[PDB]
Amino acid sequence: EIPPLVYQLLLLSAKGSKKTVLEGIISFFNQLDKRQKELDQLRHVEGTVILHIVSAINLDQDIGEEIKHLKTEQQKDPGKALCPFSVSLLLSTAVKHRLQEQIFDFLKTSITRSCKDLQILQASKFLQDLCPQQYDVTAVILEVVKNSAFGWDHVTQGLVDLGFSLMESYEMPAQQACKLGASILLETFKVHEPIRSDILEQVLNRVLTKAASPVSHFIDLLSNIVVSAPLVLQNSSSRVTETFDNLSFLPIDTVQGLLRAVQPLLKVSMSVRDSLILVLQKAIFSRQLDARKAAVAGFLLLLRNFKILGNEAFCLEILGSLRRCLSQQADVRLMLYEGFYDVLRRNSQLASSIMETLLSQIKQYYLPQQDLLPPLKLEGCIMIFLQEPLAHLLCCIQHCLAWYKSTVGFEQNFEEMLESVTRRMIKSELEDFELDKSADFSPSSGVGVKNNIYAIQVMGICEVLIEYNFKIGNFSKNKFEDVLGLFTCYNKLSEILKEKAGKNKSTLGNRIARSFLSMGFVSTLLTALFRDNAQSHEESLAVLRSSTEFMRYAVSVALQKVQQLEEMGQTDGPDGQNPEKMFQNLCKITRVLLWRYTSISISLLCLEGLLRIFNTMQQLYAARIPQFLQALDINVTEKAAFQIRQFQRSLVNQLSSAEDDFNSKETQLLITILSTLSKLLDPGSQQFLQFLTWTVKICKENALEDLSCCKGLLTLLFSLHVLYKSPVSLLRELAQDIHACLGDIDQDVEIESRSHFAIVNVKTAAPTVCLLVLGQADKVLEEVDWLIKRLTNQTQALEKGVILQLGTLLTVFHELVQTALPAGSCVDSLLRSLSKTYALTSLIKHYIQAVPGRLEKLVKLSGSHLTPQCYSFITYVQNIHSESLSFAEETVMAKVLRDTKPIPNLIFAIEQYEKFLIHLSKKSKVNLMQYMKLSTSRDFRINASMLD
Amino acid sequence: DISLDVLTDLVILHPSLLLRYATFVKTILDSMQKLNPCQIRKLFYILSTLAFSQRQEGSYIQDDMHMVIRKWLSSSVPNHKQMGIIGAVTMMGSVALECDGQLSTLLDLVGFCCEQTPEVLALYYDELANLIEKQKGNLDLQLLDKFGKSLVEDFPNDFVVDLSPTVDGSFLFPVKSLYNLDEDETQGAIAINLLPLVSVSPICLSPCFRLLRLYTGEQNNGSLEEIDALLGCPLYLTDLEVEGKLDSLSKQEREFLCSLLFYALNWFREVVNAFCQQQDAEMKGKVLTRLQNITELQNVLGKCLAATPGYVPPPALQSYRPYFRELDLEVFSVLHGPAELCFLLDDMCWKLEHVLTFSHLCQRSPKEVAVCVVKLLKPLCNHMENMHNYFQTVNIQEYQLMSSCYHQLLLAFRLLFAWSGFSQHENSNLLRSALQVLADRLKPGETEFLPLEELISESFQYLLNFQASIPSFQCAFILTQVLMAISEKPMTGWKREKMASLAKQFLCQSWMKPGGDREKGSHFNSALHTLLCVYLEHTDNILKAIEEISSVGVPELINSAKDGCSSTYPTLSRQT
């Protein structure tokens, strides 16, 4: 009887009134759907009524504006307005060509508000506690596509338009918008057959002319949709050929990912392969740096596009292209050295030809002379400029030689000349070298930079042969001393000359320069060096362990590699793009890194690494955490609780140590390592609590005078007591200590010398803590504004928490504004934050619509705890800045209109809050001003007696 | 409205392209219900011209909207009836720039629709009057006679009575012929029946006189020999002195008496509104006496309408215009006493306020208003001069009357000079023409095409010849506003000193209503605000001026005037 009912309703709406019919039908179908989800006969009828409503809005366009009802419902209480049928109806009407933008920006603001709300709830469980009602628009909008598998056409058009403008409006809530758009586009592509070509055309037209904003979303969702359905491009008659022009816009990573995505369709389709080979052939000899970079990037992929390792003309014809390209500049000579190994893992005789080409290349600078004066033909790499990166070429040579050796005429020659070079470097010291002067380097000089590029190039030369001798020799003492001599040449020429005269004027934040080692090699080195003691050891590591300088470099290279995995998503050396491969490498190196730390600076290096493994583990390998956690030997928390416990033991021993043994660099990393590992402890575990009570009890007892140590530890406590309870209890206690620790605003009454925390001493109550407390206080006020926004049967519960929290929050500022703060930015933060908490106005402004006793008590508290104390602060800041202004050159206009600007703003905030009390006092028929006092102002009188 | 304008441009440039989507537009009009009267009278006016000029789907859309009207001739929604009727009249307006069969169908349609209901009949007649008045330039005579032949049977078959009283002796009040014709015994029977027309409803009586005027203006270039002798009609009403019976408060006849006199007064308003403009022998004085008669009728209307605490007449005393049969601008064309001129300027003031700054006040362009006022301001200026001399000579009844006439007239000049359109130079040519007319009136000859600032000087000497004779502060303030409106936007030093002195003495001029009771109030406050703002803007040393006002102007008021004023400025008071 529902189709006849909807028929009579739209008949009535066509001519008669149209106000409440839509609300009734949407509510009825809401309850119908909530029943149904707990099938086909319902989907068909729902599609029919959707079509009837879209026809009604098409013919009778006046039924859509009455968007106003949904907007009012959302404003009255956020969330409970985007019902699945309501959103489906507006989505269908979004393609009406009329009123699209109003509906569309309503959806945009609703979805961004919902994602921000989800972010806050994931950042605050207390809001989840008092506001369990959550409305996640992502799920309901990704459920429509699940329901759109029943012949919905205009619904699908609305979906694809919504996604297109989603990528348009992207450019973190913007990243969440990208995620939602990719999800909805993938769903509507996967299940809708006749529109998938339209989706492909839209995404192909949207990627172009888009490079300023991060556009990796286009390539990633394109890869996902083509790996789900590769035949769409051929169904679209392979419209990817026009995209080959992207070699000039931004082919730094977009081309690589695009080719990665389209790999199977290039393989199956000969026409697109021919187009790619011709476009790259015309691109390679373009003499542009960008064009050549795009060409070599495409070459890195096309060789492995075709597989024969387990059509031979295709194999042999591609050999000479990179050989010809090798003659170009060093910058374009760079990436081929790295990418050769990837394709060399995919060939047998092509590998032999590639080795022969590389051997002919290295003969250019070999100088075959049988162990005499060093083979430095670096003079050719001068055209102040550099022509060939010898270090990268040598690294590629070593890696490819290792691959060839492991796989199963010139190869014997290849090994001996490499061995000859190793025997030549050990015999060629900094006496036969041309760069024997300690200060021949000169920045911004035609010869100094020539020495600098020679200096950096030889460092990579030494590093590569370190890998060779370690790998070619197997527990053979003769090769180990060669490694010692190589680093002896390396350190003697890297520790001094460079970073003395080369570049060390600014303090080096980083360490030993960019290394050309293998993540596999460094893993083998550390695992063989530490946590390895067997009869196969030929006493070579015993003399190797004496080289503590080699020890520092041996781990600093690893810190460089995982930092590449920190800042970027990849690294150097072989197996830099196979995420499982380093995951195993990271799984292996972490233990020996931990073992070295637990064996007992040098350990400072490995511990810094562990901080960056855990950081990289969560930020990159989020889905792969359980195996890594279990690899340290299923619930992550029990193993995580074990891991922090050993770190807890290190801290408690280290913190309890004397001040002479504080090694602050260790403390910062270990504090941060907990703040990173404590992130993934699950909410429903007890170990959450005893750890949380441990850091509280360690805060109550320990009295640390370091500043960054206190700042880092407090961040951990406030990054964990933000998802379990209300932090205002902690903030109040911190404010209790700060006021007790420091003096008083009136310097007349003595605060009792309490100590809630031992960390806060006569020194740490400086901006060190007082800026963190006000930082947390600002955060609490920020979400309260959202709660006040939500407040404007569930309403009563919302008002309970807000009044309770603001009551506690007022006790925080009341005890904090009475603090005798020092000069500087800490005073400025308090004055501005006081302007924030008063903007108390919005809650008063909302309740004008209504009175409750609890709200009256808050104003009673606010009047008796904030305003009279707040004005006392202004009478004090005037003299502390007068004292601070005497220390000028011992113009000034900057320092007089910058330390006093907050004062007028604070006055305005007080009166604006005071003014809205007038409105409530008259309207609410209750006088709530007997609690507070009269407003106080100030004047002056220029002391002309002391004018001069 | 912007979209209707661009659609009008599209249809005038080429209708054919619109006809491609004109079917969708027509179906849209058939679909939604958000119609408004003006957008109907434009949309239907545009929509019908395409059918009989171009042929793409003209028959389809034409018959579609025709059938829409027929189906909704008496709609369930009541307002659709009147919007359909205005649509119909604008159809025959476009047609009367063949349609004979369709015209017959629609006229029979509306005739069946207007069977006995008078409200739709009154609206139909009013909209037809609007049609003919707007398209007076050229309407088809024979087609109009085919359609509008009811004129000979509407008025002179239902509201024509013998001059002698011989009908309905026993009635509510005896029928008395007031305001008799000047030349008695010229027609066999000339008297309009409204008192026996208690109810044909008397609502449909005022607009149809305008209709007869337009019919006689279209049948002949003049408007004589068909109604010329039928203007001097002794108007058949109750006894004149029945206002003494208002104390009875019948509420059964006196309530009907109010509508009776209201309809008769609207009749008279049309009488002056109709044939004043025409110039002919032995009829100007009749128009003047009719204007005196409407003055008296308003006077008698005032008391009876004040007696009843609420009453609703149909649109078909001072703020009563919407229920009043509106007067046109052709009345002042024949300006060639105090109360009558006060009334004329009273109903002129609102028009000049709206045009220069249903709702029949909104159908003339400001440029046309300017050319009309400059066309016929000479008798205006002559009467201004004579009554200015009267004011220069020195009972309340004429003094206050002429003071109000003076104030309304100077308000007329202010909004004739404060018209914001003067900012652009396009209209400044007609402005210069008006200034030459004014200067020629002031200085005979030797004043053609004098330069702009000297024209300002001429207007300064002329319009300030009336400076010494100002009865009300309103007149003085509005004169200052007149000059501010005519003075240069970049204000010049000689005018700076002139206006400084003039407003100084105006603030120093006493203001006394004839019966005491100094001219205070709320309009007085706003006028004082604007005048003193203009003064302080044009005074040379503004700081010295405000210092004087705050040093000697106020303290005398603060120490002396309990209810009086400051000695230096009688315009300053405790209230002001």
Short mmCIF file of C-alpha atoms in Angstrom, two decimals, chain A residues 41 70 81 211 227 275 619 705 798:
data_model
loop_
_atom_site.label_atom_id
_atom_site.label_comp_id
_atom_site.label_asym_id
_atom_site.label_seq_id
_atom_site.Cartn_x
_atom_site.Cartn_y
_atom_site.Cartn_z
CA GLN A 41 11.11 -6.80 -3.96
CA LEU A 70 17.75 19.06 5.87
CA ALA A 81 20.26 14.62 8.89
CA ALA A 211 50.51 18.91 -10.59
CA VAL A 227 43.85 -4.23 -11.38
CA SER A 275 52.90 3.91 -28.93
CA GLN A 619 53.62 5.42 9.55
CA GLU A 705 66.04 19.79 35.24
CA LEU A 798 25.74 17.32 26.39
#
